[PDB]
Symmetry: C3
Subunit: 222 residues, 3 copies
Amino acid sequence: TGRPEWIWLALGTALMGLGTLYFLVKGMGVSDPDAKKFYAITTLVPAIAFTMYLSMLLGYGLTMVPFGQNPIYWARYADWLFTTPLLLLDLALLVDADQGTILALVGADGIMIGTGLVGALTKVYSYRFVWWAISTAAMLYILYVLFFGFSMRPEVASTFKVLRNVTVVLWSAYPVVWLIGSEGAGIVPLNIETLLFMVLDVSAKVGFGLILLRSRAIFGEE
Amino acid sequence: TGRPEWIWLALGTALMGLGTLYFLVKGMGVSDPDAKKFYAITTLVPAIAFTMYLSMLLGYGLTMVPFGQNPIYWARYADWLFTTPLLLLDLALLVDADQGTILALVGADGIMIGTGLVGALTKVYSYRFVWWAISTAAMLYILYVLFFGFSMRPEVASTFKVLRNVTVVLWSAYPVVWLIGSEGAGIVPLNIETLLFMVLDVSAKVGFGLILLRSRAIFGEE
Amino acid sequence: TGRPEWIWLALGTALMGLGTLYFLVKGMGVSDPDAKKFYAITTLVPAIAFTMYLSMLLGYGLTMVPFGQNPIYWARYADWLFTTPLLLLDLALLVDADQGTILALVGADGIMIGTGLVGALTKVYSYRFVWWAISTAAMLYILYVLFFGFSMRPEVASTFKVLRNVTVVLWSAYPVVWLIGSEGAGIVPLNIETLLFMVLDVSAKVGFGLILLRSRAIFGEE
Ligand SMILES: *C/C=C(C)/C=C/C=C(C)/C=C/C1=C(C)CCCC1(C)C
Ligand SMILES: *C/C=C(C)/C=C/C=C(C)/C=C/C1=C(C)CCCC1(C)C
Ligand SMILES: *C/C=C(C)/C=C/C=C(C)/C=C/C1=C(C)CCCC1(C)C
C-alpha cells in the first residue's frame, strides 16, 4: 500500500475475480458444445487477468527499468499475451472464421504484445517508441481484419457487430495510455495510468463477456 | 554431485530418457491416425521431462530465491507447463471431449502451473501460499472436470477410468509435496522432496504412458 | 554500430521487413481458405524474424554469458521458437499430414529450440555441447519425419519435394554454425557467424516463402 496505484490494482483484482466467478456459475449446466467453447474462452480471460492483477498488487509483476529507475508492470504483457488472442478467438468463432484468418489474428496479436513488452523493457528511451510503432501497426492490422477480413445468423451478426465495436474502441485506447503514461512520455502519472488500464481491462474482459454470454449467438441454432 | 539431491535428478533423467526411447521404438510402424496422436503426445511427455531433469542435474534449472537463500528448481515448471496439458489431452482425446472442454482443461492447467511458478519465485514468504492456494483451486477444477465434465467404447471407458484414477491420485500429491518441502514450509528437506517428485513424475509420465500405449483404446475401432 | 556484426543485423532486418511486406501485398484478395492458411503462416514467419532481427540490431536481444564474457544473441531462439514450427506447419499442411504427425513435428521442434537456448546460456563450457547434441537429435528426428513420416496432387508433391529439400539443407547448416561460432567452439568470429545466420534465415524464410506462395499447390484444386 506504499504505492499510490495499489488501490486500482486491488479493485482490478476484485473485479476480475468476481467476473470469473460469475461466468463460472453461469456456465454451469451448459451442454451445447458451441456455447461451451464461448464459456471456456470467456471465463479463462478474467481468470488469467485476476492472477496478473494480483501479481501486480503484491509487487511480483513489477520491475524497475532504467531510462531517462522507471516502474514497469511487466505482468500486464503476461496477461495480454494470453487474454488478447482468446478475446479474438471469441470474435472469430462467432463468425465461423476460416483457420487462415484465425492464425493471422493470433499471430498479429502475439507480435503486438511481444513488441509491446520489448518496448516496455527497452533501456534506450528513443527506441521504446520504435517498438510502440511496430506494436501499433500490428494492432491496426488486427482492426483491419476485424472489419474487412470478415456473420450468417442475424443474432450472430448483431452480437459480433457490438463486440467488434467494443473491441475497436477499447483496444485503441491502450496504445494511447502507454504512449502518455510511465512506459512512454511520462506525462500522466503511473497512478492514473493504472486506473485507466484497470477501467479498460475490466470493460474489455468482463464487460465484453457479459455482452457475449447473455446473447443467444453462442448456441448452435432446435 | 555436491548437492545431495543429485542422485534423484540423475535417476529421474535416466528413467525419463529410457521411457522416451521405449515409447519411440514402440510407436514405430503405427499407421492408425488416432494411435499416432496418442504416441506423439505420450512420447513427447517424458522427452520434455528428460530435458528438464537434465537441466536440474547440471544446475541450469536451479535458482536461489531469498525468503525467510532458498534453492528453487524452476525447471520443473518449464516441464509441467507443457507436459501437464499434454497428459490432459491424452485423457481428453480418449473420451472424444468437446473442444470447449479441452480449452477449459488446458487453460486451467496453464493457470495451475503459472501460479505455481509465481509462488515458487515469490520473495515474501506469506504470499507464496496465496499462490499455492490459487494453483490448488485450479487443480481442483481440473479434477472436477475429469470426473463430471465427461467414453463410449467399453475399452475406451475402462482405460480412461484407470488413467483418470491414476491422475487424480498422483497429481493431488504434488501440492502436498510443495507445501511441506523447500518451496513451502520447509519441513521436508530438498533431498527428500526431489525424490518424491521424481517418483511422482516418473509414475505420472512413464507409468501413465505404459498403461495407455498397451491399451487398444488408442486405435479407431476393422 | 560499435559492434562489427551490426551490418548483417541491419541487412537482416531490412530483408525480413521487405519480405513481410511483399507477402502481405501478395496475399491481398485471396479468398481460398487453403491459400489463406499458407499466406497467414508464410507472412507471419518473416514478420516475427523482422522484430527479432531489430531487437538484435538495437542491442535488446543480446546478453553476455560467462564461460571459458561471451556475447550471445538470445533473440534468435525467441524467433526460432515460433518460426520453425510455422515453417513445419507449411510443409505439413501441404501434404495433408495427420494431426499426430504435426504434433510430433511441433513438439520435436520445441525441444530442438528449447535445448538450443539452454545450450546458448549454459555457463559450464563442456555442458553447452551436451545441449547441442540433444538439440541435434531432435533436428534429425524432424528430418526423418519429413522424409519417412509422409502428397497426393502432383503439384502438391513437387512443391513439397522442393521445399523439403530446401529445408533439410538449410536447417542442417544451423547446428554447424552454432558449433563453430561464438556459442560453441569459437573458431569463427561472431561477425561472420551473424552473416551466416542472416543468409540462412533469409533463405529459409523469404526464399522458402517465395517458392511456396508462387506455387498453385496452395489452392484447393474448379
Ligand atoms: C484485456 C486486455 C486487453 C484487451 C489489452 C489490449 C491491449 C492492447 C491492444 C495493447 C496495445 C499496445 C500497443 C498497440 C502499442 C504498445 C503498447 C500496447 C501493448 C499497450
Ligand atoms: C509430469 C508432471 C506432473 C503430472 C505434474 C503435476 C503437477 C501438479 C499437479 C502441481 C500442482 C501444484 C499445485 C496444485 C499448487 C502449487 C504447486 C504445484 C505447481 C506443485
Ligand atoms: C528461420 C529460422 C530457422 C529455419 C532456424 C532453424 C534453426 C535450427 C534448425 C537450429 C538448430 C540447432 C541445433 C540443431 C543444435 C543447437 C543449435 C541450434 C538451435 C542452431
